[PDB]
Design a protein around this ligand. Structure first.
Ligand SMILES: C=C1CS[C@H]([C@@H](C=O)NC(=O)/C(=N\OC(C)(C)C(=O)O)c2csc(N)n2)N=C1C(=O)O
Length: 259
């Protein structure tokens, strides 16, 4: 289609590898660009961990208010919220918000621990029908996004279908889905990504990711006015390990999608 020709040109101009999946819930039409290729997830996996903890809270009613100790050994590479509560506690709600809205990696590790390890996150994905997602590692002081490594990857097609089920579908209970949507809409890290390519009258919830090999990711649920919502996944990674971030590529992909 015309959109795929433009995304291919964007990718060629960028020097990297671009992956896009759009789902239009109006008639379930899809637009894919490398939609079945693997990409390193980076911080975009946090949505699946936060969703898995929300799912547990459907039976453990008070779970989100449970206090969790933050210890100095808990701190990893990037912890802007958790470092403010070392030798104190945060609730699972506050950790979920920190992971999703400030991409706090210590907060993500507490979600992972609550789920019994990364296999608990992957398990929740399999349970809601995502056969592609795999979370293999916790966040650590040294993380990787190495070309060809299957660890901690998914495909754009898979993550878009998953993000739709979690946010617009009913993979979660009604209060849980609304909490996740609120969390995503309140993200602070995405202004330069997918949001930057979209008409400002559209409502967006998103979660970003960034890593080495200049990996630059964003996954978003999009509410245009007077129109069925969309879900858009944009993954981007580069051949050089020390490559710079390219949030502009994600903004440009989203602008191409929005036509
Ligand atoms: C700007 C950041 C870094 S921390 C956090 C995380 C998730 O993507 N990224 C990393 O932990 C990370 N590097 O972070 C910095 C850049 C702070 C770093 O430690 O060098 C990384 C490398 S490989 C991999 N997988 N994740 N998420 C974001 C985001 O864009 O939302």
């Amino acid at each position: 289609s015309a959109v795929q020709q433009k995304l291919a040109a964007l990718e060629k101009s960028s020097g990297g590898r671009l992956g896009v999946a759009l789902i239009d819930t109006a008639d379930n039409t899809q637009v894919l660009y490398r939609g079945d290729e693997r990409f390193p997830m980076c911080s975009t996996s946090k949505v699946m961990a936060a969703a898995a903890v929300l799912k547990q809270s459907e039976t453990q009613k008070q779970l989100l208010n449970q206090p969790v100790e933050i210890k100095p050994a808990d701190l990893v590479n990037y912890n802007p919220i958790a470092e403010k509560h070392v030798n104190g506690t945060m609730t699972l709600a506050e950790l979920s918000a920190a992971a999703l809205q400030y991409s706090d990696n210590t907060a993500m590790n507490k979600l992972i621990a609550q789920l019994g390890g990364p296999g608990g996150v992957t398990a929740f994905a399999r349970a809601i029908g995502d056969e592609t997602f795999r979370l293999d590692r916790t966040a650590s002081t040294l993380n990787t996004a190495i070309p060809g490594d299957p660890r901690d990857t998914t495909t754009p097609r898979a993550m878009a279908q998953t993000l739709r089920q979690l946010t617009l579908g009913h993979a979660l209970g009604e209060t849980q889905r609304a909490q996740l949507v609120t969390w995503l809409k309140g993200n602070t890290t995405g202004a330069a990504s997918i949001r930057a390519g979209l008409p400002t009258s559209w409502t967006v919830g998103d979660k970003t990711g960034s890593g080495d090999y200049g990996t630059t990711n964003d996954i978003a649920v999009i509410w245009p006015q007077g129109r069925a919502p969309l879900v858009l996944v944009t993954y981007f990674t580069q051949p050089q390990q020390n490559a710079e971030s390219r949030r502009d590529v994600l903004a440009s992909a989203a602008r191409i999608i929005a036509e």
